[PDB]
């Protein structure tokens, strides 16, 4: 497939932006724009067609493209940042993660498989409101799931669940095994995605990182499985938190997307008669302040753990984080 | 495939549904429901099994598949109305329409081909407004398309324009010739759905009836492809306004959403400045009157003017449809 519209321009067009597939510049707004709202179908399609993946794992190009459309079917469009585009970017984003120098010949085949499928299923059906909110609603999804990781549990569930139908099944022709252990991979990797995780996440990267073995080639020694999928979670988690080390174009296009859903909540909660969480609450939070906050508090130290981790790969992109906080600060009209 | 979503109950509800295929009552709501939203996409794959056009047209399940949920992408689910619920609905309808008993073996698989296709794209990418919205605002649409049957010109534009990529080329094993009278056929009956076509449309469906020619068995003589196209385009006409002729339940339904579109409509012309269309006026336009209107109007003419072709085929449609009229007068707190 070279287009999903009726605009033959296009095909061009996003046939442009994709020769930025492996970059961390690559624009996935104009992808989406290109692609007729199809951006997590097309990059996926594209990511794996650059790894060889329909290849070396036997998937058909015709049921790859209809479980990817159908996954992307499943992100609501009417959430304005946990939507498809935001599951494009986190699989591109893994996509050049993956292929980080002092990572290179660490992962197999299947894991490679795995962190592109978890970054592409890790937010699917997401109603666009916090687990808290979930909890302290009572939704159907935390009386299912005993209030624990909601909404990545559900994450999971659905995008397991749309592999069962033969005309979906992209894993068909893996063995019994292989299925096996990428299931469990991108079970670990989905739910590490859950914020209420983060700083026991990092904490113990920082362990690994502490004592970490780099090969005389500039290589990390990662020896068994357990190293490894630490490491493949907190790579998942970083893509997932990857927006304010991009380009400050491409970042605040993302925190439009992310107050819009924030302070929708706070709406929701107000109209329900609930105590509006501070970041959600429009008539008094600042979204500069958010930004700077979060990069401080959140984002620096997991992407400082992560470049320290693969130095010096990651030196420009913590440039560029540390540059956006300062665009946001200078956004502050305080000092 | 058995269902779109994640719902394993669905898949039997789905198919209990379809048990109503071939029949005026099959309820298209339900249908979309258990199909997560995919009503056109579902309905045309139980259609074009059920006349086993797949195998007479050598079509892939698999090509088949993609293109129509790329079509039923294309229609807009913000709008009220012209959606893909719509389509759906006009393509099941031609269905039922298509095996009435007058004009059995009439139509050769090419023409059913068509028609069903036809009633699928009719109205794809509808943005919601009149054809005279469009002219008047000078928008884009109309200045490609130089005032005339603005929309329909640009649903046919979409369908056809949708077929050239070959993973979506459903119509690949047709010959040349095939290909282009089918072309022809389906750009007749789409153009034929234009309102301001409707008057001359329906004179000269009366002046068919008139000198009509029923064979010995029952069934109507249309010898040639002028007649039989004739027959075709007033067909998807009269499926189109098909919505009064449906249970009163479905009736409803479709009403509300054909008000939410006509209001909107005249929410956009008030927010422009413009003159406000009347019947799209929700300060001022009865709901009621609207259908009554309608149907003495514009439904019954036709409908009339069709049972009278294929009597006595139609006889328990107009009676529903003259029961449905006396519900909305009644609703109507005036004499
Ligand atoms: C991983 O799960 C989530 C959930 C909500 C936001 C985010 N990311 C934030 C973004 C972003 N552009 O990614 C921007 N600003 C934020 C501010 C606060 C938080 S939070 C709710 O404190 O984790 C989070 C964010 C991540
Ligand atoms: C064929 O193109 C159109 C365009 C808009 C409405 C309709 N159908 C009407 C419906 C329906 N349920 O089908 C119901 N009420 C109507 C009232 C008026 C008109 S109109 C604009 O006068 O053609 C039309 C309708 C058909
Ligand atoms: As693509
Ligand atoms: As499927
Ligand atoms: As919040
Ligand atoms: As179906
Ligand atoms: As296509
Ligand atoms: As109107
Ligand atoms: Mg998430
Ligand atoms: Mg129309
Ligand atoms: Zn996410
Ligand atoms: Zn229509």
Chains 1, 2 share one sequence.
């Not at 927006?243 to 107050?259: C, F, V």
């Amino acid at each position: 497939i070279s287009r999903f519209g009726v605009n033959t321009e296009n095909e061009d067009h996003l046939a442009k932006e994709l020769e930025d597939l492996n970059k961390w510049g690559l624009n996935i707004f104009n992808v989406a724009g290109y692609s007729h709202n199809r951006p997590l179908t097309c990059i996926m399609y594209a990511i794996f067609q650059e790894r060889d993946l329909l290849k070396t794992f036997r998937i058909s190009s015709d049921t790859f493209i209809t479980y990817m459309m159908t996954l992307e079917d499943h992100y609501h469009s009417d959430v304005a940042y946990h939507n498809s585009l935001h599951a494009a970017d986190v699989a591109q984003s893994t996509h050049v993660l993956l292929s980080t120098p002092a990572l290179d010949a660490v992962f197999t085949d299947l894991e490679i498989l795995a962190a592109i499928f978890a970054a592409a299923i890790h937010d699917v059906d997401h109603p666009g409101v916090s687990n808290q909110f979930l909890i302290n609603t009572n939704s159907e999804l935390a009386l299912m799931y005993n209030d624990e990781s909601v909404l990545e549990n559900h994450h999971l569930a659905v995008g397991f669940k749309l592999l069962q139908e033969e005309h979906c099944d992209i894993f068909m022709n893996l063995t019994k095994k292989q299925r096996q252990t990428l299931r469990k991979m991108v079970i670990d990797m989905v739910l590490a995605t859950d914020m209420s995780k983060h700083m026991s996440l990092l904490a113990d990267l920082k362990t690994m990182v502490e004592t970490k073995k780099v090969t005389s080639s500039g290589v990390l020694l990662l020896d068994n499985y357990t190293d490894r999928i630490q490491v493949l979670r907190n790579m998942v988690h970083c893509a997932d938190l990857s927006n304010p080390t991009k380009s400050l174009e491409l970042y605040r296009q993302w925190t439009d997307r992310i107050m819009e859903e924030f302070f929708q909540q706070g709406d929701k909660e107000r109209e329900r008669g609930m105590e509006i969480s501070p970041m959600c609450d429009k008539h008094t939070a600042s979204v500069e302040k958010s930004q700077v906050g979060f990069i401080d508090y959140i984002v620096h130290p997991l992407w400082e753990t992560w470049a320290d981790l693969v130095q010096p790969d990651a030196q420009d992109i913590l440039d560029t984080l540390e540059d956006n906080r300062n665009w946001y600060q200078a956004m502050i009209p305080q000092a």
